[PDB]
Amino acid sequence: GSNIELHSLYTSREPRVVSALQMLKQHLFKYQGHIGAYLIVAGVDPTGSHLFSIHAHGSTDVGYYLSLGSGSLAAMAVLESHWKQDLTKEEAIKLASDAIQAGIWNDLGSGSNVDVCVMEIGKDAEYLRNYLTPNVREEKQKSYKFPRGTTAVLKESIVNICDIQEE
Amino acid sequence: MDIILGIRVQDSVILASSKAVTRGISVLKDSDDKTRQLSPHTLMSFAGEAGDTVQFAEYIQANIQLYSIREDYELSPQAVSSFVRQELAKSIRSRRPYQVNVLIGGYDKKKNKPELYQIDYLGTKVELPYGAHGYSGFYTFSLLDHHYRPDMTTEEGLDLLKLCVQELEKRMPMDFKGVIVKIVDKDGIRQVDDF
Amino acid sequence: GYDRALSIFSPDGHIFQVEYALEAVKRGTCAVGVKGKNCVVLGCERRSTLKLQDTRITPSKVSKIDSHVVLSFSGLNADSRILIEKARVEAQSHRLTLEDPVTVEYLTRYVAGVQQRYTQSGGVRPFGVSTLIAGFDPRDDEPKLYQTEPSGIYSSWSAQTIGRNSKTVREFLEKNYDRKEPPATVEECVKLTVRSLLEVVQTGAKNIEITVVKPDSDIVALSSEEINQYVTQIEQEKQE
Amino acid sequence: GYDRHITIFSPEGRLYQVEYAFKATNQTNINSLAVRGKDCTVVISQKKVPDKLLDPTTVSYIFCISRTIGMVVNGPIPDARNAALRAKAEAAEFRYKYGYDMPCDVLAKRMANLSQIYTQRAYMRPLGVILTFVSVDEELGPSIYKTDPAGYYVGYKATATGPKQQEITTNLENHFKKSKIDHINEESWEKVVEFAITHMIDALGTEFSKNDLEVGVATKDKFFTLSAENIEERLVAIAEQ
Amino acid sequence: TGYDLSNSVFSPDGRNFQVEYAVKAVENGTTSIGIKCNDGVVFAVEKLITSKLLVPQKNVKIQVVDRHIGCVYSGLIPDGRHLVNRGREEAASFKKLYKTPIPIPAFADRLGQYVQAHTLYNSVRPFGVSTIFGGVDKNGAHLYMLEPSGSYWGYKGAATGKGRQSAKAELEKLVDHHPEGLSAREAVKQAAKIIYLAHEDNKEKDFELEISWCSLSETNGLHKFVKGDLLQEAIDFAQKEIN
Amino acid sequence: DRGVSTFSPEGRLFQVEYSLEAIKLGSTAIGIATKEGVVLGVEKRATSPLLESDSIEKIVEIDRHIGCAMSGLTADARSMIEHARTAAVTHNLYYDEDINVESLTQSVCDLALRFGELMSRPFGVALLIAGHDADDGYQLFHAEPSGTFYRYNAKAIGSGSEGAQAELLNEWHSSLTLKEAELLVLKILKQVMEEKLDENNAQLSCITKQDGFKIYDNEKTAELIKELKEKEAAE
Amino acid sequence: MTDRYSFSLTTFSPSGKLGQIDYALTAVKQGVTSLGIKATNGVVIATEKKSSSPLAMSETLSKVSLLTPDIGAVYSGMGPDYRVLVDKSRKVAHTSYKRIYGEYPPTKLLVSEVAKIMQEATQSGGVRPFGVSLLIAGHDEFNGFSLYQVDPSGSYFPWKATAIGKGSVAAKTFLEKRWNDELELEDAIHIALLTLKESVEGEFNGDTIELAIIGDENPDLLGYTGIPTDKGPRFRKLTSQEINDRLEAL
Amino acid sequence: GSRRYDSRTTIFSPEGRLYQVEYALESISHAGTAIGIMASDGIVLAAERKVTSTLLEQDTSTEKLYKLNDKIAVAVAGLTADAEILINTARIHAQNYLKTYNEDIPVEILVRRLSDIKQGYTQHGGLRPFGVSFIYAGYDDRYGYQLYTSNPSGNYTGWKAISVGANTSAAQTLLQMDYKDDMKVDDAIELALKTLSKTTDSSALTYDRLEFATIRKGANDGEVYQKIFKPQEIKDILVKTGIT
Amino acid sequence: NNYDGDTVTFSPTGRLFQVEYALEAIKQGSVTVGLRSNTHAVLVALKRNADELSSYQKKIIKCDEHMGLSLAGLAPDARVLSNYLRQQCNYSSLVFNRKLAVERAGHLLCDKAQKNTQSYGGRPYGVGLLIIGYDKSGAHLLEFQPSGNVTELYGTAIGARSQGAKTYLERTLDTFIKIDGNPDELIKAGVEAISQSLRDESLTVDNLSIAIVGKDTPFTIYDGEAVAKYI
Ligand SMILES: [Cl-]
């Protein structure tokens, strides 16, 4: 991302997904899989909209729908069942979050919330942090707030965080 | 080597170190001094892998002596211990690490206080009232936890040290051929020739 | 790297850079070394152009290389620190490997070797420093006094001076120093060293530094008052 | 006076070695011209084969840097080929590292930065060349970017380089003052080449045969040079109107 | 002034005087030529017999690069050898990576870039040789000539050394009188003549003729030296023409 | 300025020729080779009477069978001696034998021309290398900063060299004894020296097969000086 | 080959002058005028787009450059030297700061890094000094708005307002009369345009003038939404139209 | 080759002087005067900014006084860019010492290190020396309050009171006249400002043309405080001492 | 003049003065002669002494069992170049089990000397060499100049007054080339050739140095009483 920004400034052009893809794969390949990064790279640029996957050893794949991680099989099952050509934005978000939910529920390595990011052509990318929150913890039966003075203390002291003082 | 002990009393630090040098199935020497004087008021005992122990000790000694000449000044025990720790902490991630554990007993002439530092080969430093390396602590810390009081006199420290050595001679399997005892105080370093 | 040959021969067979380094020594404050029967004394000039100086912290002219050897110098002050540092490192290295402190001759040979190396190495200029190295060999009561110079030559001296107006004080020492009977005591040796500096120094106040080295690592620097007593006694005998 | 031998500042704040490299630029006595069409960028250059023993096919100052980028050089051929080989290497490396074809303006900047280094570092001399890069960029469209020994570079609507650059420059300036557009409003590249040749004839005041010119044309996704017969066809069309 | 004391320095003209001084060393050397024929190339060189003690046919000047390229040069002979040694390294690495033998235009640039590199710094001297070279590749015959500046072009005929003006005039006649082309065997004969005619500029000492050739039909596209009967046939033809 | 490794129009290296001038300013050193041994003698030349003359070391041991005398910038000789000693010892380690005097000299002379822009300048010192081996017997070599070494029956280097060499020309013959050579070195040193020759400002040494290389005591040399004075007064 | 110039090309003369730095400053003096003015809520930097030919597209040549989202730079002197400095300045902002602290460097520290690079060209072997003076305007959270000048020597000074290059002496006098500590950004832009008109001979419009500001955060120029703490770059280059609008109220 | 253009920065003159060092000192003699005065209860650092402008942002500006650590500070005279290179090196050295020994670096050791770096540039490398002279004001528990100076030669010396930069001859005479050993910080502050006021090439000494700092044990109990004076605080001390 | 400061500088007429000055060092050197027949190749060298007490500087160096040279000029440079030849002869044997061709040996020397004439910092070699050898194509004689120029010859001479010996060989060309299977007569011709370069001094027992290589004759050097036969 740093090198892409510098490259964008050098070329006076908006960065391309294939540039990030190429820079990532060559870096990962060089480290022979020891950098355990498995990525799904997506974005829009002057060339159009793109979607790629990257594995730790440096291999890349193209597709209309992709999934990675321990819950990728649960997700891919949903994608293979419901994906179609010419999806709308609203349909794609739904399909994407449903694929993540499949992982959340059925995969122990996955859980909690669903994060989404939509990159549409000719628009600002919208990052939807905690798009879904289907795992809020229920209220506890009891409050475990202690009575003050419950813990036994030996010593107390003020810590000097300030600098050396004047006068 | 085997057993190295340290105890910091009121006005001095006492280091006890075994005399045996066993190389396999034979006790080669029974009068080995496992210590080096780093500066007039700083003593370092050591134990670990053969060769590495002396090589490390003399390397540290040389560095501190070089500092003393350059600045015409003796480093504090705390400063020397920090220098030693850094060398070992550097060493542990080397091609071939120094396999050496040390105790640094010094008398700080500025603060007028004895100071005992225990540092292992990983570069793990701790300031203690009494310390040990290897299996020595397993026997001796219970006695020290019991009979030690911080206002002890050097003579009381030596008596408590005798109690430690007696327990070691009773329960340890290896014959370490007694110990050489050295005292570090305001007047410098001296050896107790009868122990 | 910068490889330029700065020290080179001239048509008349001179290495001007080495010779110009001697001119830097000629400019430096006077230093003198006198060895007695059981001691060596190193005298050093302090130019009184610099007052408001803090004499506690200002780098002293005589430097301990080890507990038994000392080094004074004339010439570039910054250059002298590099030689002193190298010498101190070599002194500890010698103790570490040989298990015995350096002889005064060995330490001199090392410092002289460093100075020589800088006269035929690329990209470096010679040291603008001559040194006086004095002390006592381990377990030996014979006094030692050596001199070095930018070219790298070194030699032993019964008494010697270097720096500005060293020609004058060498003149004094040559007529006043007797080899058959050197200064038998510390007093006589210090007195002769102070006398020799008084030929050149100006005022005998804070312009003279004296350092006495005795056998078995017994090195002490005299104070202002102690030196001032020598200065007083010398001139009172002179008024006759 | 060693401030005139290496690239250090003179008391006036000038770099004489850079200025003298500019003078080497005109040593070949060749004039080049570059113009932009709607879908293309055309570059023409004088071709002079003074020796009859020369193989005229090998005499060229136009280079195919990449599939998309072409480069004409004003200056001695050794420095020209030095710049050409480097630009080819840089263009290929760029495609490998970043996954898309190096733009004309980016290559120009890169070569300009390399030239800047020679003006600052003493051991490296400037190249005595002016490099004119042409393409039809996939983002910016028809593009002309020119580099010189000072490390300066800029984009152009049209440009000219050589001994008689000023005459050509003014001729082109006057045309664009009339049309009031940043290019030659023409569909086919053939007619844009005809325009380029016609206006060089008018500016220099000399007639050209097929062997007196050298033409390079940049279109979308390829740059190519015209043969003598392709140029002859171009000269015939000019004469017939 | 002082611009001519250091290599890679531009004079106020925009000239590199050191390269121009290297040319003077080339102009001082013996004559060498190159002739492009129908399906190949012919190289020839003048070898000055300084003394009777020189062993005939032993001090070979023309050099082969790979198995299909011939190189000849005028000026400082060691500089030429250094350039050919580089040419051989360049040709080897090309074939190592790409399998096919190095094409002549490709090979020409390898020498060109290397020679040009010796005009970029004051820590090196330019080459004191003009090199005529060429051979047969997949696209046919090619003849080149490479100057101290790194400048090179393709040629129908090429000549350098002390008798270059005489040689050039002779080469120009052949180009005019043979637009359809010249055969390989004809080119060898003509090459011999031209060296003999160009020897008038070095007429003090007598000389030894040395010829080589690459031809698709005559040598299977490999570089070979002209030896024995074919060499003597060319010498006789040359001697007949001067008389 | 100009290159350090530059040739003059006459075909000589400027720096090598200039180092030879520095050697002419050096103190005299004389070597005489005989069938009973090789004698090496030097002028100490103390700059002041306060300089302890026994610390002046211009004659040096390389090995038990090889000695060396120097003249010129004597500080430059230290690294040459160190190399010589290392070469001599190293060869013994590799081959379980003494090294040939010529081979030792050749190893020293290889350093000479290792200067450029390696060390920054040639050595400013000439060496007389004297020794013995089983193959070629007693030998004396003159090692210069040019990298050239000549073998000599007798040789003088330093400030009084051409005067001393002319004297050695007449005096040397193939039947000289060791005692005769000792006196001859003392005689010629006394001739070319500025100050009056005695045991403190001049030093003798020899190399024999039996005893090896030996620097002479001041008491031993003093007797040879007294023996010289009497034999010159004898006619 | 090898760079055999391992020695300094800038050295002290008997008078104590560093010739090459002085001569670099002379090159800066010949350069086109550029200026910088600091307001209470922003900074403005401006210069003339001196087009070398009317056939040249002067939009492709950027004299005012973004270094970070909140820092911009302009120069006077040798353009090519400026261009490479901007490349290095952009990179050093990442390598020596952003990749360590996860945030962009404050103006003064980025200036310090640029200054360091220029100092090294004044002392290192086989190089001449950079023949430019930079004006770096920027904003950061703890220091607020700031404007720095950086000379060929590597020396840098913070300014309320200043000018460099051709007509700097006259321009600085003009700024001294107009500047106060209560200027709003629009007032500074107005003063910048007035000051810059004096040094310009020919055409004076949005196409011949290059002007940028460090002001309010531009969330419209960020490129994405969804992170409240990311509010967009404070650096903004004024358009040709935006300049001409303010030239009518001039 | 390249030899032709080599100035040879590290050579002796026939008189035995280092050309570049001497010329660097000439450069420094035109720099704004900096003064250091050591007292029994602290140290004062005063320095003059060079012909400033009204448009210079003074409160964020720093060209003379720099902080090396919490105990040590320096006053600069010469090329500011050169000084910052050395300052960053010094700051790193102090941190290295602290990491190694877990104690703050003694003032002299830091001063020696920087002075050794300067020395190196005069003996090897073929590069120009740093055109900088420092005044080091610092404290440690061995020697207490200490003043040092270093110059391009790499030579350093200790002082009770000292000046560097312009008009040091005049300044040093004035300090030598009014300085006494039992002097205190408040008195030293006054002496420093009075000296600058007389030696300045400017018409009058004002707050905007000065940088000022004090190192005091005037910190709550046994510890040391550095005080880099703000523009308003320099203005107040100028009124207090009776200069404006 | 202004263009003789280093080897990297051509003069305005295209000359390399440092190389020419190196060539001058050879002319100052003592004379040495080389000549061959079809069976044998011979080196004859006039050794030079410093004075009457000194030894006579050795002029001939062995490179292999079948190859060696004589020197004229800077002797240390001949040691460097002869050492290089020894290594190259040796590399050919160890790697290819092949004796190094004399022509190829000359090519290697040429290229080594050339690098010193085109680079900054270095200097040309200050010595000339006459290489003789017997390989698979018979007897050979080479003349090496430190400009880089190497030349195969029937006979030649280099050093001071070498023109006299070179003219003699030029007359005797037809005679000595035919001296096949007779080493002593080929040496005689070489000793008679070098005699044409003598003035004042004559060939003595410790003055003369001869070497020979041939069909069934390893490269061997003759000095001292071994050459008294030919005086
Ligand atoms: Cl770049």
PDB file of N, CA and C in Angstrom, chain F residues 2-3 5-11 13 106 110 113 146-154 165 168-169 172, chain I residues 4-5 18 21-22 24-25 28 48-55 57-58 74 76-77 79 121 123-124 126:
ATOM      1  N   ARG F   2      49.666  14.209 -10.407  1.00  0.00           N
ATOM      2  CA  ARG F   2      50.220  13.196 -11.306  1.00  0.00           C
ATOM      3  C   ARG F   2      50.150  11.837 -10.613  1.00  0.00           C
ATOM      4  N   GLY F   3      50.044  10.770 -11.401  1.00  0.00           N
ATOM      5  CA  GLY F   3      49.954   9.416 -10.858  1.00  0.00           C
ATOM      6  C   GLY F   3      51.155   9.026 -10.017  1.00  0.00           C
ATOM      7  N   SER F   5      52.158   5.872  -9.871  1.00  0.00           N
ATOM      8  CA  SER F   5      52.807   4.833 -10.673  1.00  0.00           C
ATOM      9  C   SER F   5      53.183   5.340 -12.072  1.00  0.00           C
ATOM     10  N   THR F   6      53.524   6.622 -12.177  1.00  0.00           N
ATOM     11  CA  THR F   6      53.806   7.249 -13.469  1.00  0.00           C
ATOM     12  C   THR F   6      55.246   6.985 -13.913  1.00  0.00           C
ATOM     13  N   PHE F   7      55.420   6.741 -15.211  1.00  0.00           N
ATOM     14  CA  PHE F   7      56.746   6.629 -15.826  1.00  0.00           C
ATOM     15  C   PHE F   7      57.251   8.001 -16.258  1.00  0.00           C
ATOM     16  N   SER F   8      58.546   8.238 -16.073  1.00  0.00           N
ATOM     17  CA  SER F   8      59.191   9.434 -16.606  1.00  0.00           C
ATOM     18  C   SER F   8      59.491   9.214 -18.085  1.00  0.00           C
ATOM     19  N   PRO F   9      59.788  10.296 -18.829  1.00  0.00           N
ATOM     20  CA  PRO F   9      60.142  10.137 -20.245  1.00  0.00           C
ATOM     21  C   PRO F   9      61.356   9.240 -20.505  1.00  0.00           C
ATOM     22  N   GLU F  10      62.209   9.067 -19.497  1.00  0.00           N
ATOM     23  CA  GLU F  10      63.389   8.206 -19.604  1.00  0.00           C
ATOM     24  C   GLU F  10      63.068   6.728 -19.346  1.00  0.00           C
ATOM     25  N   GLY F  11      61.850   6.444 -18.885  1.00  0.00           N
ATOM     26  CA  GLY F  11      61.406   5.071 -18.628  1.00  0.00           C
ATOM     27  C   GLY F  11      61.665   4.599 -17.208  1.00  0.00           C
ATOM     28  N   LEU F  13      60.246   4.940 -12.997  1.00  0.00           N
ATOM     29  CA  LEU F  13      59.135   5.310 -12.128  1.00  0.00           C
ATOM     30  C   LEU F  13      59.570   6.437 -11.204  1.00  0.00           C
ATOM     31  N   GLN F 106      63.660 -12.473  -2.296  1.00  0.00           N
ATOM     32  CA  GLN F 106      62.652 -12.355  -3.353  1.00  0.00           C
ATOM     33  C   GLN F 106      61.267 -12.059  -2.778  1.00  0.00           C
ATOM     34  N   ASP F 110      59.047  -8.594  -3.451  1.00  0.00           N
ATOM     35  CA  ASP F 110      57.703  -8.643  -4.034  1.00  0.00           C
ATOM     36  C   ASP F 110      56.797  -7.548  -3.468  1.00  0.00           C
ATOM     37  N   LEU F 113      57.021  -3.072  -5.206  1.00  0.00           N
ATOM     38  CA  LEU F 113      56.208  -2.385  -6.222  1.00  0.00           C
ATOM     39  C   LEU F 113      54.693  -2.492  -5.993  1.00  0.00           C
ATOM     40  N   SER F 146      62.812  -0.606  -5.672  1.00  0.00           N
ATOM     41  CA  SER F 146      62.427  -0.855  -7.061  1.00  0.00           C
ATOM     42  C   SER F 146      61.907  -2.279  -7.266  1.00  0.00           C
ATOM     43  N   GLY F 147      62.120  -3.143  -6.274  1.00  0.00           N
ATOM     44  CA  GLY F 147      61.790  -4.560  -6.387  1.00  0.00           C
ATOM     45  C   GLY F 147      62.963  -5.374  -6.904  1.00  0.00           C
ATOM     46  N   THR F 148      64.081  -4.700  -7.167  1.00  0.00           N
ATOM     47  CA  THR F 148      65.277  -5.340  -7.691  1.00  0.00           C
ATOM     48  C   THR F 148      66.201  -5.698  -6.537  1.00  0.00           C
ATOM     49  N   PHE F 149      66.808  -6.879  -6.611  1.00  0.00           N
ATOM     50  CA  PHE F 149      67.834  -7.279  -5.650  1.00  0.00           C
ATOM     51  C   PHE F 149      69.052  -7.853  -6.367  1.00  0.00           C
ATOM     52  N   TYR F 150      70.220  -7.331  -6.011  1.00  0.00           N
ATOM     53  CA  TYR F 150      71.487  -7.821  -6.522  1.00  0.00           C
ATOM     54  C   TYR F 150      72.198  -8.567  -5.404  1.00  0.00           C
ATOM     55  N   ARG F 151      72.863  -9.665  -5.748  1.00  0.00           N
ATOM     56  CA  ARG F 151      73.767 -10.325  -4.812  1.00  0.00           C
ATOM     57  C   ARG F 151      75.105  -9.595  -4.869  1.00  0.00           C
ATOM     58  N   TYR F 152      75.790  -9.518  -3.732  1.00  0.00           N
ATOM     59  CA  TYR F 152      77.065  -8.813  -3.641  1.00  0.00           C
ATOM     60  C   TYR F 152      78.085  -9.608  -2.838  1.00  0.00           C
ATOM     61  N   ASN F 153      79.353  -9.487  -3.219  1.00  0.00           N
ATOM     62  CA  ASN F 153      80.457  -9.943  -2.378  1.00  0.00           C
ATOM     63  C   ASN F 153      80.656  -8.959  -1.235  1.00  0.00           C
ATOM     64  N   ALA F 154      80.499  -7.678  -1.549  1.00  0.00           N
ATOM     65  CA  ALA F 154      80.504  -6.618  -0.552  1.00  0.00           C
ATOM     66  C   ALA F 154      79.650  -5.462  -1.060  1.00  0.00           C
ATOM     67  N   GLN F 165      81.940   2.120  -1.332  1.00  0.00           N
ATOM     68  CA  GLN F 165      81.917   1.087  -2.372  1.00  0.00           C
ATOM     69  C   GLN F 165      83.231   1.060  -3.149  1.00  0.00           C
ATOM     70  N   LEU F 168      85.596  -0.669  -0.832  1.00  0.00           N
ATOM     71  CA  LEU F 168      85.319  -2.108  -0.876  1.00  0.00           C
ATOM     72  C   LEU F 168      85.797  -2.741  -2.183  1.00  0.00           C
ATOM     73  N   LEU F 169      85.805  -1.952  -3.257  1.00  0.00           N
ATOM     74  CA  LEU F 169      86.275  -2.410  -4.569  1.00  0.00           C
ATOM     75  C   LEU F 169      87.726  -2.882  -4.489  1.00  0.00           C
ATOM     76  N   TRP F 172      88.246  -5.918  -1.042  1.00  0.00           N
ATOM     77  CA  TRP F 172      87.662  -7.264  -1.053  1.00  0.00           C
ATOM     78  C   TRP F 172      88.424  -8.243  -1.948  1.00  0.00           C
TER      79      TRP F 172
ATOM     80  N   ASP I   4      51.016  13.044 -21.022  1.00  0.00           N
ATOM     81  CA  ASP I   4      51.848  11.937 -20.543  1.00  0.00           C
ATOM     82  C   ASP I   4      51.741  11.730 -19.026  1.00  0.00           C
ATOM     83  N   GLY I   5      50.752  12.370 -18.401  1.00  0.00           N
ATOM     84  CA  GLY I   5      50.543  12.257 -16.959  1.00  0.00           C
ATOM     85  C   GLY I   5      50.030  10.895 -16.520  1.00  0.00           C
ATOM     86  N   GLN I  18      52.759   7.289 -21.918  1.00  0.00           N
ATOM     87  CA  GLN I  18      53.140   6.398 -20.816  1.00  0.00           C
ATOM     88  C   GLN I  18      53.557   5.020 -21.323  1.00  0.00           C
ATOM     89  N   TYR I  21      56.939   5.575 -22.906  1.00  0.00           N
ATOM     90  CA  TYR I  21      57.951   5.686 -21.858  1.00  0.00           C
ATOM     91  C   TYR I  21      58.285   4.316 -21.272  1.00  0.00           C
ATOM     92  N   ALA I  22      57.278   3.455 -21.155  1.00  0.00           N
ATOM     93  CA  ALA I  22      57.502   2.073 -20.738  1.00  0.00           C
ATOM     94  C   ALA I  22      58.361   1.345 -21.771  1.00  0.00           C
ATOM     95  N   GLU I  24      60.545   2.760 -23.544  1.00  0.00           N
ATOM     96  CA  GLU I  24      61.882   3.330 -23.372  1.00  0.00           C
ATOM     97  C   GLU I  24      62.705   2.567 -22.329  1.00  0.00           C
ATOM     98  N   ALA I  25      62.042   2.067 -21.287  1.00  0.00           N
ATOM     99  CA  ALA I  25      62.710   1.281 -20.243  1.00  0.00           C
ATOM    100  C   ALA I  25      63.361   0.015 -20.800  1.00  0.00           C
ATOM    101  N   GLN I  28      66.751   0.804 -22.443  1.00  0.00           N
ATOM    102  CA  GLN I  28      67.803   0.974 -21.433  1.00  0.00           C
ATOM    103  C   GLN I  28      68.316  -0.376 -20.928  1.00  0.00           C
ATOM    104  N   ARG I  48      73.628  -8.176 -16.885  1.00  0.00           N
ATOM    105  CA  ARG I  48      74.244  -6.924 -16.451  1.00  0.00           C
ATOM    106  C   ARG I  48      74.506  -6.950 -14.950  1.00  0.00           C
ATOM    107  N   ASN I  49      75.698  -6.508 -14.550  1.00  0.00           N
ATOM    108  CA  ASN I  49      76.058  -6.389 -13.134  1.00  0.00           C
ATOM    109  C   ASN I  49      76.034  -4.932 -12.664  1.00  0.00           C
ATOM    110  N   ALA I  50      75.844  -4.740 -11.361  1.00  0.00           N
ATOM    111  CA  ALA I  50      75.858  -3.405 -10.759  1.00  0.00           C
ATOM    112  C   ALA I  50      77.290  -2.883 -10.674  1.00  0.00           C
ATOM    113  N   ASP I  51      78.179  -3.709 -10.125  1.00  0.00           N
ATOM    114  CA  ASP I  51      79.620  -3.439 -10.127  1.00  0.00           C
ATOM    115  C   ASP I  51      80.400  -4.764 -10.051  1.00  0.00           C
ATOM    116  N   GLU I  52      81.694  -4.700  -9.743  1.00  0.00           N
ATOM    117  CA  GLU I  52      82.542  -5.901  -9.708  1.00  0.00           C
ATOM    118  C   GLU I  52      82.257  -6.825  -8.517  1.00  0.00           C
ATOM    119  N   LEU I  53      81.784  -6.262  -7.407  1.00  0.00           N
ATOM    120  CA  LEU I  53      81.389  -7.068  -6.248  1.00  0.00           C
ATOM    121  C   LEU I  53      80.031  -7.743  -6.445  1.00  0.00           C
ATOM    122  N   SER I  54      79.197  -7.180  -7.319  1.00  0.00           N
ATOM    123  CA  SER I  54      77.819  -7.648  -7.481  1.00  0.00           C
ATOM    124  C   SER I  54      77.712  -8.857  -8.403  1.00  0.00           C
ATOM    125  N   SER I  55      76.586  -9.557  -8.302  1.00  0.00           N
ATOM    126  CA  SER I  55      76.258 -10.642  -9.221  1.00  0.00           C
ATOM    127  C   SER I  55      75.687 -10.065 -10.507  1.00  0.00           C
ATOM    128  N   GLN I  57      72.660  -9.840 -12.941  1.00  0.00           N
ATOM    129  CA  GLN I  57      71.199  -9.971 -12.938  1.00  0.00           C
ATOM    130  C   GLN I  57      70.737 -11.054 -13.909  1.00  0.00           C
ATOM    131  N   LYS I  58      69.938 -12.002 -13.419  1.00  0.00           N
ATOM    132  CA  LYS I  58      69.430 -13.080 -14.270  1.00  0.00           C
ATOM    133  C   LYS I  58      68.412 -12.535 -15.274  1.00  0.00           C
ATOM    134  N   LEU I  74      62.336  -3.603 -16.668  1.00  0.00           N
ATOM    135  CA  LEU I  74      62.044  -3.814 -15.249  1.00  0.00           C
ATOM    136  C   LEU I  74      61.898  -5.302 -14.941  1.00  0.00           C
ATOM    137  N   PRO I  76      61.210  -6.895 -12.055  1.00  0.00           N
ATOM    138  CA  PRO I  76      60.027  -7.280 -11.272  1.00  0.00           C
ATOM    139  C   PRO I  76      58.756  -7.452 -12.111  1.00  0.00           C
ATOM    140  N   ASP I  77      58.612  -6.650 -13.165  1.00  0.00           N
ATOM    141  CA  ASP I  77      57.488  -6.786 -14.091  1.00  0.00           C
ATOM    142  C   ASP I  77      57.578  -8.086 -14.891  1.00  0.00           C
ATOM    143  N   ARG I  79      58.929 -10.781 -13.674  1.00  0.00           N
ATOM    144  CA  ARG I  79      58.564 -11.779 -12.670  1.00  0.00           C
ATOM    145  C   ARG I  79      57.043 -11.936 -12.581  1.00  0.00           C
ATOM    146  N   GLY I 121      44.808   4.664 -12.901  1.00  0.00           N
ATOM    147  CA  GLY I 121      45.423   4.218 -11.650  1.00  0.00           C
ATOM    148  C   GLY I 121      46.631   3.323 -11.863  1.00  0.00           C
ATOM    149  N   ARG I 123      49.596   1.208 -14.410  1.00  0.00           N
ATOM    150  CA  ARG I 123      50.668   1.625 -15.307  1.00  0.00           C
ATOM    151  C   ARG I 123      51.005   0.497 -16.280  1.00  0.00           C
ATOM    152  N   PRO I 124      51.571   0.836 -17.452  1.00  0.00           N
ATOM    153  CA  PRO I 124      52.004  -0.230 -18.354  1.00  0.00           C
ATOM    154  C   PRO I 124      53.152  -1.020 -17.748  1.00  0.00           C
ATOM    155  N   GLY I 126      56.843  -2.361 -17.636  1.00  0.00           N
ATOM    156  CA  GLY I 126      58.077  -1.716 -18.082  1.00  0.00           C
ATOM    157  C   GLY I 126      59.124  -2.722 -18.508  1.00  0.00           C
TER     158      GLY I 126
END
